[PDB]
Amino acid sequence: PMLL
């Protein structure tokens, strides 16, 4: 997942 991407934590941006």
The DSSP code for 4 is -
- How is the chain split among helix, strand and coil, in percent rounded to 5? 0, 0, 100
The technique by which this structure was obtained is X-ray
Two tokens, residue 4:
């941006």
End-to-end CA, the chain: 10
Task: Compute φ and ψ for 2, nearest 5 degrees.
Answer: -120, 125
Two tokens, residue 2:
């991407």
Resolution (angstroms) stands at 1.0
